[PDB]
Amino acid sequence: MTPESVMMMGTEAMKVALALAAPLLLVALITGLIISILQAATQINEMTLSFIPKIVAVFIAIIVAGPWMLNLLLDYVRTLFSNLPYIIG
Amino acid sequence: STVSFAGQLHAALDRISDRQAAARVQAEKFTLGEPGIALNDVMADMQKASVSMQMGIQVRNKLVAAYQEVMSMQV
Amino acid sequence: STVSFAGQLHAALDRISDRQAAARVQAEKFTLGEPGIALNDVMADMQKASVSMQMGIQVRNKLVAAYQEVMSMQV
Amino acid sequence: SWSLSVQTLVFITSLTFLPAILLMMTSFTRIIIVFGLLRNALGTPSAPPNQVLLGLALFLTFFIMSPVIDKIYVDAYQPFSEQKISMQEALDKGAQPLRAFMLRQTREADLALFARLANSGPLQGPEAVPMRILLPAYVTSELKTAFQIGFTIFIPFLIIDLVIASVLMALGMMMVPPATIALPFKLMLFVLVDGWQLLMGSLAQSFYS
Amino acid sequence: SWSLSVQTLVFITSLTFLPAILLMMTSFTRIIIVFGLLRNALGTPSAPPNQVLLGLALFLTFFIMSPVIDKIYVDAYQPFSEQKISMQEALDKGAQPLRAFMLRQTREADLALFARLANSGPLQGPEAVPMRILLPAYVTSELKTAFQIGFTIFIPFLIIDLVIASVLMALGMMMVPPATIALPFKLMLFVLVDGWQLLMGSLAQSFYS
Amino acid sequence: QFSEQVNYQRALEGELARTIETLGPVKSARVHLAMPKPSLFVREQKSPSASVTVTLEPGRALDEGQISAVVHLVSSAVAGLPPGNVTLVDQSGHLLTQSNDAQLKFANDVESRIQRRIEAILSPIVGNGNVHAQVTAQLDFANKEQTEEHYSPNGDASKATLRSRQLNISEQVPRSTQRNETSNYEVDRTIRHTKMNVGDIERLSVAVVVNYKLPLTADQMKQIEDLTREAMGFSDKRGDTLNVVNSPFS
Amino acid sequence: QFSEQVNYQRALEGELARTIETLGPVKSARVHLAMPKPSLFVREQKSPSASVTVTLEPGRALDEGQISAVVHLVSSAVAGLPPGNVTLVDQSGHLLTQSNDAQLKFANDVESRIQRRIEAILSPIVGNGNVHAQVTAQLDFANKEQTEEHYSPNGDASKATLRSRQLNISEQVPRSTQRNETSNYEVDRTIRHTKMNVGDIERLSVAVVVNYKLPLTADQMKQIEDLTREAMGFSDKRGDTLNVVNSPFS
User: Fold this and answer.
1) Do D205 and F43 touch (CB under 8 A)?
2) How far apart are CA G56 and CA G29, in angstroms?
3) What GO CC terms are in its UniProt record (chains B, C) (predicted)?
4) In degrees rounded to 5, what are phi and psi of residue G179?
5) Touching check for C10 and chain D: CB below 8 Å?
6) Residue contact D174–E174, C-beta within 8 A
7) At D4, is the secondary structure helix, strand, or coil?
8) Do the chains contact at A13 and D195, CB–CB below 8 Å?
9) Does B68 touch chain E (CB under 8 A)?
């Protein structure tokens, strides 16, 4: 092992994690920002008024993004375990 | 060919068993009054069968000890 | 020079084996009728071989007990 | 040669030294360490230690060693049947395939450590190394290999835990125990990938390449 | 045949190998792993591992094995009782029904992997796979099946956890610890659904289908 | 990420293409490599492969010399590719590789050497073009291996070498006499391990014709025959054969 | 963690190009390496290889001296690269590196050297161009190994060496006599271990023609014959063969 290879594996893992999470974080931030924009202009609020919009957004994202997300994670993990023998040296 | 540990133990146990069967047949024929078989032959073969069985006992005991030491390992 | 405890163990077992071989060949040579060899020497050599083999057995038992007692402790 | 005394005296003691030296000189160290680290991932035990992981490991290492044991059989057991061989040349005849296997698995610098600290003389080739220097070298290199495999095993479940926690944090979930939600997804990633076959097979492949 | 030596020698060794290999060779692996995972849900252990779930798993596996053990009995214990069978044909006569049972649960591909890492030649039929191939394949397939059942069990309690958390956030529970709130609701869900009955029944019906 | 190794291959093949482009009788040269696979459960890892297509300069064909040049270039370029695998294909078929007849070529070289030497000696005698010789030669291509173990005889006591000797003698005086002689020797021993050369000449057949000056005289002829016997390296123990004649040329 | 290795390798290739082009009769040199992946846990590794293609100054070729120059430079440049693997290519094929047939060339230049020496000796006598010689030299290419274990014979007790010696003597006086005697010796020993040379001469065959002035005198002939015999290193035990004849050229 060399630190170059462990950083390579780490960045690959970080990019699969980011791709895995991208729709969820994206829609959460988008709906939160929309309800925060509309928070003023009738500045009335209790704490957030955005929780339910965020939940329905992540529902929609998990349904529509969905299969490609799980397929990407599975392909990553299957390739990782397949080439596991060849990375020892 | 291949090893097949189970086959090796099977063959060893068959060897022990048929050695004892030969010793038992020798004793049968001697006590039944047949020509040939001598008392020295009977005693020597019976002692050989006893020694072979004792060796089997020791090998078994060591295998069992090794097995119960291997599978008391904490993973 | 270096000890290599395996080397000392091999030497001891070889000593026991060669002593027993000497005794067995002398029994061969006595019961076969060769002149010279006397019954007192045959019996004495057999007894010496038995004592050496018993010493080997006792040393084995102590070494095995030591090993299994060292290997029974937790790191 | 030896005479049904010390023969059958070296045999019984060899069987005594079996469970530790022989199961930790061949395989079953890398495999069991990978299995234990895998079990640390995915949460709880989820496989009885003394029974299923250990037994499966014993089977698996028998399966890796079957070629080396085949060569050891051909070069020791068959000739040791009464003829031209009795536990003197038989020793190194049965060692040589195993020594070749271990050398082929050892780190090329753990040998250096355990040789230089033994005051051993300069070595001509791989065949000149003794069993003495070979054992600890193989053990240390095998521990390194096991920990590398374990790190790679911990990668994807780390990914799942981080993504789950981040989603909960973005949704505002201040105080939810993300491990509880993430555990079924850990098993998820471990079964859709068909993780047991892949892991068993990848261990076997890594072990000889 | 054998002569009351190796008979009553292999009997006692068979007894010693019983608890580990036989139990992790027949059943009680799937059952116990599924019980462990159900214990992971519902909050804390809250059911003693070392006594009650083990006993219930033993009883479940006895009940499931009763057809297998009855076939083994009629095919060995009567015909091994003194006539035409003495612990050589007893072994294979008893193995065949158990072999068929284990084959009926093995994943179609675990057998493939373990055969391919034995360098075994081509196989003609299911009767051609030996116990050497058949143990670890069955074990790995059993672990996969156990984890699948684990998903199906975690699903509803995950739903309860998330719905309680969402209600608490929308209501404005800043950082109430929703786990303590959800634990009694998990128990409530598992008691009204009559979960112990229907869980052990589901495992049983799954296990031979 | 799978793309990067493939793009490495696509880079390497182009890089080799560009090397081959710069050698003269080439207009284009495109190369395909083959890393086999990580074979499963056997540590065998069969050798890689390389297939090269070249458009030669129009009307120019490549000798086997530059064929070996390009093949050894490619083999020495690829990581661990034995040159046997490197296959070359010209602009129109004509597999320059043969992936057994090197024997024929080598034999022709030996014969040509002998023939040219014979002509070099005999040309000053009878003229530039008054002599023709042809050589057909037998070669051994079998791999010999030999191990002789000469011992020296020590039946003679005066050249015997005794490590040990027990000697007993007894006699009574009707005489009872004893003589026992246990003797251990140390024996001279010689061990050659010869691995004979492949391609050795084992039989020459040389035919020579000379022109007329009118046939050359008998002594003038036997001196020619002796000279050609000399130039062959003619050895009788090898079975070499030599025929020389004189006749009008054409 | 991989493409960096490619960058490093191709940068090294550029560096070696920059070196090689500063070698005189070179304008450009495109180079390829072949580095096997260094495993630290498997033992049986593979050596690397290098393939250099050079574009020479037009009308300039490299002798074996400069071939050795480039091959050594490249070999020692790359970590652990034996000069065998360095395959060089002239800008038109023409492998300057031969890395089964070189023995023919080896014999050829051996004969060339001996023949040159014969001509150099016999030219001052009969003229610069009144003599021709050709050499046909049989060469040995078998790997000869040997091990001799000469002992000295200690049969004669005057010059033996005894380590131990027991001697029992008895005689009664009807005479009974006994004489037992045991001896352990020390033996002189010589152990040679010769690994004979590959490529020695096993025979020579040399034919020489000398031009006329009219034939040269018989004594003048025998002195020329003795001179060329000297120049062959003529050994009768080798069975060297030599012929010298005189007759006018063409």
Assistant:
1) no
2) 9
3) bacterial-type flagellum basal body
4) -150, 95
5) no
6) yes
7) coil
8) no
9) yes
Q: Cβ separation of E166 and A46 shorter than 8 Å?
A: no
Paired tokens of F204: 């020459």
The H or E element containing residue F243 is strand F241-246
DSSP classification of residue E107: -
Smallest Cα distance from D11 to chain B, Å:
9
Tokens for E35? 């019980």
Name, in order, each residue with C-beta under 8 angstroms of A19's C-beta and a sequence gap of 6 or more: A69, A72
Residue of F nearest to D104 (CA): F43
Positive or negative, the CA dihedral F113, F118, F124, F129 is negative
Chains F and G contact (Cβ–Cβ under 8 Å for 3 or more pairs): yes
Q: In terms of Cα–Cα distance, which of G72, G139, G145, G69 is closest to G102? A: G139
Whole-Å CA distances, C12 to C1, C7, C55, D76: 18, 9, 10, 23
Q: What is the dihedral of CA D25, D26, D30, D31, to 10 degrees?
A: -130
- Chain E window 10-39: which residues touch B at a Cβ cutoff of 8 Å? 10, 13, 16-17, 20
Q: Which of residues 183-222 of F touch E (CB under 8 A)?
A: none
CA distance F156 to C62: 59
Q: Is C60 on the interface with D (CB under 8 A)?
A: yes
- Judge contact between F107 and F90, C-beta under 8 A: no
Q: Tokens standing for F215?
A: 């046939």
The first and second tokens of residue D46, run together, are: 């989820």
Find out whether E131 and E95 touch, Cβ atoms under 8 Å: yes
Nearest to D8 by CA among E14, F40, B58: B58
- Distance separating alpha carbons of residues C29 and C26, to the nearest angstrom: 5
Q: Looking at chain C, after which residues does the C atom sit over 2.5 Å from the next written N, breaking the chain?
A: none
For every residue of chain G, DSSP letters joined together read: --HHHHHHHHHHHHHHHHHHTTSSS-SEEEEEEE-----SSS------EEEEEEEPPTT----HHHHHHHHHHHHHHSTT--TTTEEEE-SSS-BS-----HHHHHHHHHHHHHHHHHHHHHHHHH-TTSEEEEE--EEE-SEEE--EEEE----SGGG--EEEEEEEEEEE---EEEEEEEEEE---EEEE--BPPSSEEEE-EEEEEE----PPPHHHHHHHHHHHHHHHT--TTTT-EEEEEE----
CB-based contact D162:A41 (threshold 8 Å): no
CB contact under 8 A, D108 and G44: no
Degrees, nearest 5: CA angle E70-E71-E72: 90
CB contact under 8 Å between E170 and A52, yes or no, is yes
Say if CB F151 and CB F209 are below 8 A apart: no
In the sheet with G205-210, reading across from the earlier edge strand, the strands are G131-135, G205-210, G241-246
Residue with tokens 């284009």: F28
Q: Do A8 and G1 make contact, defined as CB atoms within 8 angstroms?
A: yes
Q: Is D92 on the interface with E (CB under 8 A)?
A: no
Resolution number, Å = 3.7
Q: Where are the alpha helices (DSSP H) in E28-173?
A: 29-40, 54-72, 78-80, 89-103, 110-116, 131-171
CA atoms of E17 and E19, how far apart (whole Å): 6
Write out chain B residues lying below 8 Å of D15, CB-based: 59, 62-63, 66
Which strands, in side-by-side order, build the sheet including F162-172? F177-185, F162-172, G176-185, G162-172
Residue D65 touches partner F, C-beta closer than 8 Å: no
Contact D199, D60 (CB under 8 A): no
Interface residues on D facing A, Cβ-Cβ cutoff 8 A:
145, 148-149, 151-152, 155-156, 158-159, 162-163, 166-167, 170-172, 189, 192-193, 195, 198-199, 202-203, 205-207, 209
C19 touches chain D (CB under 8 A): no
CA distance A37 to chain D (A): 17
**Tokens representing residue D26 in the block:** 């061949």
Specify whether the CB–CB gap between F132 and F208 falls below 8 A: yes
